Design a protein around this ligand. Structure first.
Ligand SMILES: Nc1ncnc2c1ncn2[C@@H]1O[C@H](COP(=O)(O)OP(=O)(O)OP(=O)(O)O)[C@@H](O)[C@H]1O
Ligand SMILES: [Mn+2]
Ligand SMILES: [Mn+2]
Ligand SMILES: [Zn+2]
Ligand SMILES: [Zn+2]
Lengths: 145, 188, 83, 133, 114, 263, 146, 64, 764, 36
């Protein structure tokens, strides 16, 4: 592979490096093998990244897996979509996937507190949902001339 | 009932591309050939190169010669028929041989800078038409607003519409409520 | 549980959302023959009229912004910057 | 109210590349080792051949509609064959310690390398250009 | 159906007129006339004669949607010279040249066997 | 007789090829247009059916009816039905035709337009008659019947313009050309190797002098001379499609002056 | 010395044939046997035509007027195709066709044939082009198990 | 179902030319194009008309 | 409920934001409008005309909640309406209504349009809204929805209207551009040689509805007055709009007419094609949106299409079987190109047949052989097709479309004119479905091109039987794969949207779930709205160390390295000033840091990265707006610049909290924008490159500041859905290496799967 | 079982009569219920 790297006089150049690529994955162990750079090792298994290097690093992998897919088809989506997703998938600290009366009974017994900010719940209740134009209240300005 | 073609109806050649009629023009307004021949249909060139439907194009050359010559034109697959041949034949018969012709704009009569591929092609009227397909239900006494449509409007942020739209007509009953026990237990 | 007019920390500009709801609220009222505050230099259309109102800053309403913890800040239309 | 460059040129070359009605003269000046012209010409309305030569003046009148010939029947601030009307977009290539000014006629382009008329070529559009054979 | 009957292409609805004439704000000595139940036949014809007239500064026409038969012609003329006058002066020419031509025709046709 | 000049070159009952010469394209084209679209003509445009045990349907029949061309030389003398103060139709706005046919023969019985009878007073204005142009004097084949089948109808013709429906149009194709050399460079010819080997020469080139390879392009020329050919279908004779067509524009134009006068 | 415009075919490197095809066009079925030049078309398209054909209007039997079915479409004026295949023979398509040969122009003219749409000639329509008959039959039963 | 009355595209009447067309080919032994040109159908639009008609009525007439 | 659905058609004569509604539909759908003294006379007239004449009405409702039915109602003709009654009127021109093409996979599949009532029966649309809706005119139908109160009408127009959705957040560029014809033709119209005469000119000009009446002055006066195409399109592009672009060796004399250069609303140089006018990051529609606002932008699409399409309607364009024929000579070259490849194959054949070929490393021998013969064959296909491309002429219409960008590509030339190429099924050459052979017409053990699915012929030429069948094999595999994509993609998309649906931005700028949890402590790490973000080059990043010190270093104590005094009035007086030099060194230290920082952030060296506030373009405009002479020293001082840009930073606010924590956030959020900033308004630059005056400069800054503020995201916005739609919608046009890719992969990611299909370690 | 398609079911259907060749096509169909 080609690697752009800065040069002695400051500009970026190409500098090839050999790389190895595997079928199959043993990151904990391969990382340790003498002669490789352990700081740059990669895998497309973002689970193993998280297991070895932690939730952050897996979040960064996962992003990079999703971005791969989306640029492999040749299209482009703003950072501000895929990061959100990826945060959603990693804010409990692990990688969480994103993929009636009966239920009410359980609420009951659980004492579920419904925050009321969804749009269905609000429908039910005859209300706007606190989204968008519903996220603030409007009142009459008794303080004006 | 008789159905006369109209804006809306669908048509196809036999090369796996359809279209609806987008407007009609009477013949004065169409573009025309020195001979005075005018098209019965006008299709857009942007429909061609991606679909790589060169058989359309070849059928229309082949069909010109047929009609000029009164022979059936043999369009079966796997023969010796070739465009070069066909274009030969059509030059013998006095037209440019890849099927272009000069034509003249209708509205003004001036010639067209560009010439135009012009020929018969067999087109089919397909079933199923703007009249059967239009409906329009808004009461007195697809076509829906489903999960995904909701989602686009939450996207845009449109809460009031989302409440209007998804309500009941089911009247707003009013109710007293304890503010310690939230229940509707209250004696009013 | 309210936040004092100094020390407010949320934007001073009007949001698209606020604006859309203001215009719409006011147009509803204008639509129902509610008095108007601004010169109708001809206008007959409620939204339009509303927008004239908002441009002349004569919409006496206030926007209450909740924060995610229950707390809120009150910003008046008069004051919100409109871009 | 004026004129502001004007000279005579020697045509090195004429490329039509790829277009049919338009071609690009490379012309030299007869005079100055220095001042050149590269320039786009409608060769249908004004043909042009290698080594022919040219009396070229930019100039700056004789922004209101346009009105037909009529003014045009005596009033010709032109005793030329060929006149365009353009706009300068300049880059003052301020190159070496000679100038280039750039000019676009509906997209037919020009460019003058030189010097002596720094304090001469409008910063500005209103720029006409005129040719006799 | 939803189709407007075909007579609408040549025949005026209640309250419509053949012309409406209105002054153009953008420029002086200009007007825009909209011609109803008319199309290119006329509309290119009047226009192009307006442009043989040297006191014509501008003339143009267009049919804004094909669905309706109407066109709009815009004339601009020199100070002193009413536009509408330029359109009589022009419709007049037309009449005259055709005058002529039905004659030159009718003639060429007896000089004729078969 | 100074102005737009004419020059027929061929003429025949059915076509008239000529050259207009000293006019603008606009009027040339316009005249083409009118000829195609607005010369009034007569045509069946209502049809009541008493009986039809035919193998075709009524509307299918009717529509064929409105296509058969009918005589139209005296059609300025028939008022448009909607201008006539009659309730519905009459003799001043309408020729009425009938058709009855029964398949008497074992063999198959054709129905032609010659089988059409006019049934109303024409005031000896030559209109209404089925136009016939075949050797056998049949005119158009309208239907066919089997032994035992019957069709009876009446029709009403009425004056109308092809704008309104092409049945009413008197012209058929109208050849039109100009500049056959291409001198005006109004068109830009497509080719693979050579534009002049590749495109056919127009008959109209003979009448005009080729250009000479040196000849530098002529900016000022315009379009002055046009090669036409109007073909008539028959309800109006040809010379007439022209004359009436020049005439109809000149009418249009004048209604414009008439309504500047009314402002 | 082969015809430069013919396609390339790669000969018999074969002394052992035991049979020969009757004709290669016979790999096709009934639908694709009506496409002209399918051998000059990308493959999926001939797969769409093979459906659409199934929706075109023609004359489904000479006996329509006597049957009584739920729906039916007949075209006023079927024409046979100027360009046919040899298999149509057997399929009768020229007898009972489902299409008309239209004059067609491939052109940008006015912007109303964009995105897989078409301008059609009104006058052409007046005079018949693509008109068809449409018949629906309603049924109903009497009383029953009361 | 029956010759159409005119060329869809140009208006030429054409529905007075079917008996003859067919007489011109079975009687007088001409090839379909020579026959069409005989009837004065010289644009490819009209030629298409008669050359691709199919007279279905002739079957429909067989039923009782 | 209060909706309609029909077939859609295009219409070049409606605006971008209208939709045409047939009359009949318009008479069916209604809006309830309250009587007031503003409208009682109109409502009266509409009541009179009734239910069946459009503009009319269907019911009247009075005080009482009684409903008066206009069609039946013996008093239908004698209603005297009162203030505060309701009329349910038909909809009418310019009411807002929402239009949607299903499946509605992002929000621009539901936009708000201004009605236009029309005859016949289809809803009509401008061609340039097609693409967001992903609709065409062969059948598609769309649904139209009438809002029922004032508030909802407001919502629709003030947030969902089409014009407000030209630039979208999905990819921080336009999502609507000029297409199909008008793109064919705007290129044509803008070529060097296209000139137009007066007659046409003025008709073009009158066609743009808000032409000032001025006939422009023609670019040829001399033998003849002839205007260029460029000039007359220019009529449509409004004043004040600058755009430049360099293509592969454009220069300001573009020999080729490449690239684009446009200054105060007039085209200087370049042909106009899909780069300029398409839906492109930093093209004209993205420029005009921003510089002039959504409504002017949306007129532009229709002025441009009016103009161009008129031109095109009289110029003409078509395509034919001719445009696929390449030269005899080309064809023999093609045939040889082909022939060669077939000999390469043959040797690799014999070579393997003698056991001499090597594999390399866990790759099998046969795998090695295939991988080569398929290289060979493809390589052939491609040469042959570049062969054909070259050979066609600029008047070749296929070429002409490819060129403008409006339809087609290389592959299509190729296969139509030169060679269709190797077919495959599962990644592989056609396989031996009978025993040891692909069809019974071949003999056993044949691995050659023909026997395993290379189609050598083009479509023009024709496929043989065998080829025909293997291309059908191929084809079918896509038909299937297509369906399975469509399927998969569908369920992903709904799952993403359910997952994210509740995240929203809150007025602390945090993004959160319906619990209040924190997902992001500021949206997008920067607090921006993605609509307001554009690709810009960060300058400090690239370049040699020498070069970055030429461009940014000022040393006033050194005669070679100060600021020439022509740059600047003060320039004599500052030489050797020590105390200016202290600032300036401070400024450079910060530039130097900046470049390190950034090269840590972008380890690669990539300089172009989307950030809010296109400063080049502000500066460009400053340069035009103040008529700036590049031949005068400026009146700026050092301190003006230097302290001026320092000060601006303080004001690019995203967060507003008095404590330190929020202030640190604030700072970190605006770090990258501020690198761009200092680089771009450093002292030598502002003098030596940009030559600003004081005033212009002071204008550049305050603008930067307004624009920056206006790019902050607004509280209330529902990401989450947005994010999900944005990720999903383009995963649906994945209709299409030796790692699992594209849709299945992406299933594999969201599903968090234990057992992935190709797992791999890349080891450096 | 002929009225229903009750067997395997879709086994009997009403014969298409849109167009002639659609009929022939229908009589020459095949179907496969349920690895490639
Ligand atoms: N603008 C375009 N760019 C690229 N490919 C296109 C374009 N328009 C059509 N194609 C394509 O054509 C193919 C399908 O053709 P088709 O005309 O049936 O699409 P469609 O109109 O969306 O189909 P339908 O409306 O019936 O669902 C797709 O693979 C794609
Ligand atoms: Mn399509
Ligand atoms: Mn579609
Ligand atoms: Zn009467
Ligand atoms: Zn014809």
């Amino acid at each position: 592979y080609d690697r752009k790297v800065p040069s002695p006089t400051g500009e970026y150049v190409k500098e090839p490096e050999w790389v190895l690529e595997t079928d199959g994955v043993n990151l904990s162990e391969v990382m340790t093998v003498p002669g490789i750079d352990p700081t740059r090792i990669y895998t497309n298994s973002f689970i193993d990244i998280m297991e070895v290097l932690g939730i952050e690093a897996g979040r960064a992998a996962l992003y990079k897996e999703v971005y791969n897919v989306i640029a492999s088809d040749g299209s482009y989506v703003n950072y501000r979509h895929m990061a959100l997703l990826v945060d959603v998938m990693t804010t409990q600290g692990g990688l969480t996937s994103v993929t009636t009366v009966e239920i009410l009974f359980e609420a009951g017994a659980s004492a579920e507190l419904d925050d009321c900010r969804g749009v269905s719940e609000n429908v039910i209740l005859g209300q706007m949902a606190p989204i968008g134009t519903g996220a603030f209240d409007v009142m009459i300005d008794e303080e004006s001339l | 009932t008789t159905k006369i073609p109209q804006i809306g109806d669908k048509f196809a050649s036999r090369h796996g591309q359809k279209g609806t009629i987008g407007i009609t023009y009477r013949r004065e307004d169409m573009p025309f050939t020195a001979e005075g021949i005018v098209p019965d249909l006008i299709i857009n060139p942007h429909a061609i190169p991606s679909r790589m439907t060169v058989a359309h194009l070849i059928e229309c050359l082949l069909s010109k010669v047929a009609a000029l010559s009164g022979n059936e034109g043999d369009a079966s697959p796997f023969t010796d028929i070739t465009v070069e041949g066909i274009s030969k034949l059509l030059r013998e018969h006095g037209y440019q041989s890849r099927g272009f012709e000069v034509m003249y704009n209708g509205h003004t009569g001036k010639k067209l800078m560009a010439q135009i591929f012009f020929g018969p092609t067999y087109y089919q009227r397909l079933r199923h038409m703007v009249d059967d397909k239009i409906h329009a239900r808004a009461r007195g006494p697809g076509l829906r607003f489903g999960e995904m449509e909701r989602d686009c409007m939450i996207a845009h942020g449109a809460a009031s519409f989302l409440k209007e739209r998804l309500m009941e007509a089911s009247d707003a009953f009013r109710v007293h409520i304890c503010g310690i026990c939230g229940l509707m237990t209250v004696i009013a | 549980k309210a936040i004092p007019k100094d020390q407010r920390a949320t934007t001073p500009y009007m949001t698209k959302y606020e604006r859309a709801r203001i215009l719409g609220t006011r147009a509803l009222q204008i639509s129902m023959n509610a008095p108007v505050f601004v010169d109708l230099e001809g206008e007959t259309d409620p939204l339009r009229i509303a927008m004239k109102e908002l441009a002349e800053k004569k919409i006496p309403l206030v926007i209450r912004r909740y924060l995610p913890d229950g707390s809120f800040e009150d910003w008046s239309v008069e004051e919100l910057i409109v871009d | 109210s004026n004129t502001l460059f004007d000279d005579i040129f020697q045509v090195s070359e004429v490329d039509p590349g790829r277009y049919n009605k338009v071609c690009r003269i490379e012309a030299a000046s007869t005079t100055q080792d220095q001042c050149k012209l590269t320039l786009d010409i409608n060769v249908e309305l004004f043909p042009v051949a290698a080594q022919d030569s040219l009396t070229v003046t930019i100039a700056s009148s004789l922004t209101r509609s346009w009105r037909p010939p009529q003014a045009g029947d005596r009033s010709l601030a032109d005793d030329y064959d060929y006149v365009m009307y353009g706009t300068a977009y300049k880059f003052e290539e301020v190159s070496k310690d000679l100038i280039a000014v750039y000019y676009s006629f509906g997209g037919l382009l020009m460019r003058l390398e030189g010097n002596y008329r720094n304090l001469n070529n409008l910063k500005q559009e209103n720029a006409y250009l005129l040719i006799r054979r | 159906m939803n189709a407007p009957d075909r007579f609408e292409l040549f025949l005026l609805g209640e309250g419509e007129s053949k012309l409406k004439i209105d002054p153009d704000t953008k420029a002086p000595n200009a007007v825009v006339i909209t011609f109803e139940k008319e199309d290119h036949t006329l509309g290119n014809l009047i226009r192009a004669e307006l442009l043989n007239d040297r006191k014509v500064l501008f003339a143009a026409y267009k049919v804004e949607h094909p669905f309706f038969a109407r066109f709009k012609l815009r004339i601009q003329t020199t100070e002193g010279y009413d536009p509408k006058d330029a359109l009589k002066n022009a419709c007049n020419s037309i009449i005259n040249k055709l005058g002529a031509l039905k004659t030159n025709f009718e003639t060429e046709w007896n000089l004729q066997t078969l | 007789e100074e102005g737009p000049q004419v020059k027929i070159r061929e003429a025949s009952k059915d076509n008239v090829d000529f050259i207009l010469s000293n006019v603008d394209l606009a009027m040339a084209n316009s005249l083409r247009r009118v000829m195609i679209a607005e010369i009034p003509t007569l045509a069946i445009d209502s049809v009541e059916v008493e009986t039809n045990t035919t193998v075709l349907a009524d509307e299918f029949i009717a529509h064929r009816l409105g296509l058969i061309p009918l005589q139209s030389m005296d059609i300025e003398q028939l008022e448009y039905s909607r201008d006539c103060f009659c309730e519905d139709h009459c003799d001043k706005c309408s020729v009425v035709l009938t058709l009855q046919a029964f398949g008497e023969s074992e063999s198959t019985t054709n129905v032609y337009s010659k089988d059409l009878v006019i049934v109303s007073n024409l005031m000896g204005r030559n209109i209404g008659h089925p136009i016939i142009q075949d050797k056998e004097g049949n005119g158009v084949l309208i239907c066919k019947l089997r032994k035992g089948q019957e069709l009876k109808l009446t029709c009403v013709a009425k004056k109308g313009i092809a704008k309104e429906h092409a049945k009413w149009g008197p012209a058929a194709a109208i050849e039109f050309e100009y500049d056959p050399w291409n001198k005006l460079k109004h068109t830009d010819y497509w080719y693979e190797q050579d534009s002049a080997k590749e495109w056919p020469q127009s008959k109209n080139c003979e009448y005009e002098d080729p250009p000479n390879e040196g000849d530098p392009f002529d900016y000022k020329a315009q379009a002055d001379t046009f090669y036409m050919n109007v073909e008539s279908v028959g309800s109006i004779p040809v010379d007439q499609v022209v004359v009436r067509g020049i005439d109809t524009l000149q009418k249009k134009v004048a209604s414009i002056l008439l309504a500047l006068t009314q402002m | 010395d082969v015809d430069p415009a013919k396609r390339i075919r790669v000969s018999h490197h074969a002394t052992t044939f035991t049979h020969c095809e009757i004709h290669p066009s016979m790999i096709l079925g009934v639908a694709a046997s009506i496409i002209p030049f399918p051998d000059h078309n990308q493959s999926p398209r001939n797969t769409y035509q093979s459906a659409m054909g199934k929706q075109a209007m023609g004359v489904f039997l000479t006996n329509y007027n006597v049957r009584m079915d739920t729906m039916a479409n007949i075209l006023y004026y079927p024409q046979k195709p100027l360009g046919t295949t040899r298999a149509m023979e057997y399929l009768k398509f020229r007898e009972l066709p489902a299409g008309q040969n239209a004059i067609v122009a491939i052109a940008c003219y006015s912007g109303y044939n964009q995105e897989d749409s078409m301008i059609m000639n009104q006058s052409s329509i007046d005079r018949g082009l693509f008109r068809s008959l449409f018949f629906r039959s309603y049924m109903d039963q009497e009383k029953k198990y009361g | 179902m029956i010759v159409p009355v005119r060329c869809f595209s140009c208006g030429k009447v054409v529905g007075d030319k079917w008996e003859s067309y067919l007489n011109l080919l079975q009687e007088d032994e001409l090839d379909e194009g020579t026959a069409l040109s005989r009837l004065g159908l010289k644009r490819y639009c009209c030629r298409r008309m008669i050359l691709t008609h199919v007279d279905l009525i002739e079957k429909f007439l067989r039923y009782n | 409920d209060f909706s309609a659905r029909t077939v859609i058609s295009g219409d070049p004569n409606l605006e971008l934001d209208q939709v045409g509604v047939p009359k009949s539909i318009a008479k069916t759908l209604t809006y309830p409008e309250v009587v007031t003294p503003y409208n009682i006379d109109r409502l009266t007239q509409l009541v009179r005309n009734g239910p069946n004449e459009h503009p009319g009405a269907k019911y009247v409702i009075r005080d009482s909640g009684d409903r008066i039915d206009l069609r039946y109602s013996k008093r239908a003709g004698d209603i005297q309406l009162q203030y505060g009654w309701k009329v349910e009127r038909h909809i009418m021109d310019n009411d807002p209504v929402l239009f949607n093409r299903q499946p509605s996979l992002h929000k621009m599949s539901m936009m708000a349009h201004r009605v236009k009532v029309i005859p016949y029966s289809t809803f009509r649309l401008n061609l340039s809204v097609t693409s967001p809706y992903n609709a065409d005119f062969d059948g598609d139908e769309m649904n139209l929805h009438v809002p029922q109160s004032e508030e909802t009408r407001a919502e629709l127009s003030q947030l969902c209207a089409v014009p407000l959705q030209i630039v979208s957040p999905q990819s921080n560029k336009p999502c609507m551009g000029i297409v199909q014809d008008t793109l064919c033709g705007i290129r044509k119209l803008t070529l060097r040689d296209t000139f137009i005469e007066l007659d046409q000119v003025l008709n073009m000009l009158y066609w743009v509805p808000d032409w000032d009446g001025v006939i422009p002055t023609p670019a040829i006066i001399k033998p003849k007055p002839l205007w260029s195409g460029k000039q007359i399109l220019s009529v449509a592009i409004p004043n004040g709009i600058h755009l430049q672009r360099f293509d592969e060796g454009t220069t300001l004399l573009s020999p080729k007419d490449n690239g684009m250069l446009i200054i105060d609303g007039q085209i200087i140089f370049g042909v106009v094609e899909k780069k300029t006018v398409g839906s492109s990051n930093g093209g004209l529609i993205h420029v005009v949106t921003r510089e002039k606002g959504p409504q002017v932008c949306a007129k532009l699409f229709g002025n441009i299409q009016k103009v161009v399409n008129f031109w095109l309607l009289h110029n003409g364009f078509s395509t034919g079987i001719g445009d696929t024929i390449a030269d005899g000579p080309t064809m023999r070259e093609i045939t040889e190109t082909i022939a060669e490849a077939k000999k390469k194959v043959l040797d690799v054949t014999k070579e393997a047949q003698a056991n001499l070929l090597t594999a390399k490393h866990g790759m099998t021998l046969r795998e090695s052989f295939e991988d080569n013969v398929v290289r060979f064959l493809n390589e052939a296909r491609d040469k042959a097709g570049r062969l054909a491309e070259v050979n066609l002429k600029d008047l070749n219409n296929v070429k002409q479309m490819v060129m403008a960008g409006s339809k087609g590509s290389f592959i299509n030339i190729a296969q139509m004119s030169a060679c269709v190429g190797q077919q495959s099924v599962e990644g592989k050459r056609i396989a031996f479905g009978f025993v040891d052979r692909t069809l019974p017409h071949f003999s056993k053990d044949d691995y050659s091109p023909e026997s395993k699915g290379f189609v050598e012929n083009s479509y023009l030429r024709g496929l043989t039987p065998q080829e025909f069948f293997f291309h059908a094999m191929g084809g079918r595999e896509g038909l299937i794969d297509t369906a399975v994509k469509t399927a998969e993609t569908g369920y992903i998309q709904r799952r993403l949207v359910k997952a994210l649906e509740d995240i929203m931005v809150h007025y602390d700028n945090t993004t959160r779930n319906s619990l209040g949890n924190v997902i992001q402590f500021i949206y997008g790490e920067d607090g921006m709205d993605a609509a307001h973000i554009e690709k810009q080059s960060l300058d400090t990043i690239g370049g040699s160390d020498a070069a970055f010190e030429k461009r940014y270093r000022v040393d006033l104590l050194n005669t070679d390295h100060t600021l020439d005094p022509s740059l600047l009035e003060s320039g004599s007086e500052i030489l050797g000033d020590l105390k200016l030099q202290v600032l300036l060194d401070e400024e450079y230290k910060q530039l130097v840091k900046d470049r390190k920082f950034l090269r840590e952030v972008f380890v690669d060296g990539e300089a172009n990265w989307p950030l809010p506030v296109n400063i080049r373009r502000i500066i460009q405009n400053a340069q035009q707006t103040f008529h700036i002479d590049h031949t005068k020293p400026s009146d700026l001082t050092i301190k003006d610049i230097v302290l001026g840009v320092k000060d601006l930073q303080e004001n690019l606010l995203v967060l507003r909290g008095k404590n330190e924590i929020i202030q640190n956030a604030q700072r970190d959020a605006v770090t990258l924008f501020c690198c761009l900033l200092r680089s771009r308004l450093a002292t030598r630059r502002v003098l030596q490159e940009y030559r600003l005056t004081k005033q212009a400069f002071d204008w550049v800054l305050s603008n930067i500041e307004a624009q920056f503020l206006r790019s902050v995201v607004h509280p209330g916005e529902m990401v989450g859905v947005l994010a999900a739609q944005s990720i999903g919608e383009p995963a649906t046009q994945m209709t299409l290496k030796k790692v699992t890719s594209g849709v299945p992969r992406l299933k594999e990611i969201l599903n968090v799967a234990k057992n992935m299909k190709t797992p791999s370690l890349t080891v450096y | 079982a002929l009225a229903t398609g009750n067997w395997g079911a879709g086994v009997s259907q009403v014969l298409n009569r849109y167009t002639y060749s659609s009929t022939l096509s229908h009589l020459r169909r095949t179907n496969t219920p349920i690895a490639k």
